[PDB]
Amino acid sequence: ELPQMVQQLNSPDQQELQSALRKLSQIASGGNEQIQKLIEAGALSPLVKLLDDASEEVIKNAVAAIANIAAGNNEQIQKLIEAGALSPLVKLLDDASEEVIKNAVAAIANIAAGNNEQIQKLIEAGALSPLVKLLDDASEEVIKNAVAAIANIAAGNNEQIQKLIEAGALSPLVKLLDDASEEVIKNAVAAIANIAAGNNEMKQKLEEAGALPALEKLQSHANEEVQKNAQAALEAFN
Numbered sequence: 001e002l003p004q005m006v007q008q009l010n011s012p013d014q015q016e017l018q019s020a021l022r023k024l025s026q027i028a029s030g031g032n033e034q035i036q037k038l039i040e041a042g043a044l045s046p047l048v049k050l051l052d053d054a055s056e057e058v059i060k061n062a063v064a065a066i067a068n069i070a071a072g073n074n075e076q077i078q079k080l081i082e083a084g085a086l087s088p089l090v091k092l093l094d095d096a097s098e099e100v101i102k103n104a105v106a107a108i109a110n111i112a113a114g115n116n117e118q119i120q121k122l123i124e125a126g127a128l129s130p131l132v133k134l135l136d137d138a139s140e141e142v143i144k145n146a147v148a149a150i151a152n153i154a155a156g157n158n159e160q161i162q163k164l165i166e167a168g169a170l171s172p173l174v175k176l177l178d179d180a181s182e183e184v185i186k187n188a189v190a191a192i193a194n195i196a197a198g199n200n201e202m203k204q205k206l207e208e209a210g211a212l213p214a215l216e217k218l219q220s221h222a223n224e225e226v227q228k229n230a231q232a233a234l235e236a237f238n
Contacts, residue, residue: 002027002041009046014055021050021061028068035072044069044083051088056097063092063103070110077114086111086125093130098139105134105145112152119156128153128167135172140181147176147187154194161198170195170209177214177230182223189218189229196236203237212237 008020024043027034038044047069050062066085070077080086085107092104108127112119122128127149134146150169153160164170169191176188192211195202206212218230 002037002043006041006043006046009043009050017058018061021058021065025061025065025068028065032072032076035069035076038069039076039079044079044085048080048083048085048088051085051092056095056100059092059095060097060100060103063089063100063107067103067107067110070107070114074114074118077111077118080111081118081121086121086127090125090127090130093127093134098142101134102139102141102145105131105142105149109145109149109152112149116157116160119153119160122153123160123163128163128169132167132169132172135169135176140184143176143179144181144183144187147173147184147191151187151191151194154191158198161195161202164195165202165205170205170211174206174209174211174214177211177218182221182226185218185221185226186229189215189226189233193229193233193236196233206237 005020005023008016009024011017011020024038027038047062047066050058053059053062066080066089070080089104089107092100095101095104108122108131112122131146131149134142135150137143137146150164150173153164173188173191176184179185179188192206196206215230215234219227221227221230
């Protein structure tokens with residue numbers, strides 16, 4: 001069954017391709033068990049190879065599917081890295097299609113929710129600079145996923161945190177503390193709370209970026225969850 005569907009990803013017949021990516025997309029949204037079947041049927045390489053396809057809609061749907069695989073356990077994120085997903089995902093961050101970028105950012109956020117070695121592979125694949133750029137970008141949905149990726153990276157090791165900072169993440173993150181979106185604010189606050197847990201160079205860099213007044217302002221944001229997160233971030237500075 002699934003082997004047949006995997007073969008169809010490589011079919012030049014466009015409605016059969018679309019159909020195969022359909023079903024696979026469906027399975028990938030099942031749990032980790034479902035993802036595991038896909039891994040074991042060899043779906044990953046052919047999926048990554050679709051990220052270079054002529055149709056932006058195939059790219060969009062192939063990337064959505066990879067985003068869903070990457071929401072699996074750390075063994076399954078590992079399998080994506082070993083399929084070469086990371087460099088094409090990063091290339092897509094300046095895709096001509098905002099919908100493709102949105103989904104490529106979601107995939108990279110998921111991967112960054114993996115372990116420190118998976119964060120590291122993202123860094124080595126050049127993810128940080130384009131992500132920082134997407135923090136200031138015409139589309140809320142792109143910004144939302146981009147801060148979620150930066151937050152996830154900020155949960156890594158102190159080496160990776162210094163890389164975030166050197167990529168210029170701090171002032172865009174401080175700006176996002178005033179975003180119109182509550183989802184955006186909570187991920188910006190999380191990122192900043194992660195960075196604040198690090199050294200005093202890092203705490204000082206945050207004060208420098210203007211984090212303190214921006215966090216204090218959120219103590220009166222309409223949503224109480226936001227106030228509370230903001231206060232817990234202020235408390236990470238001790």
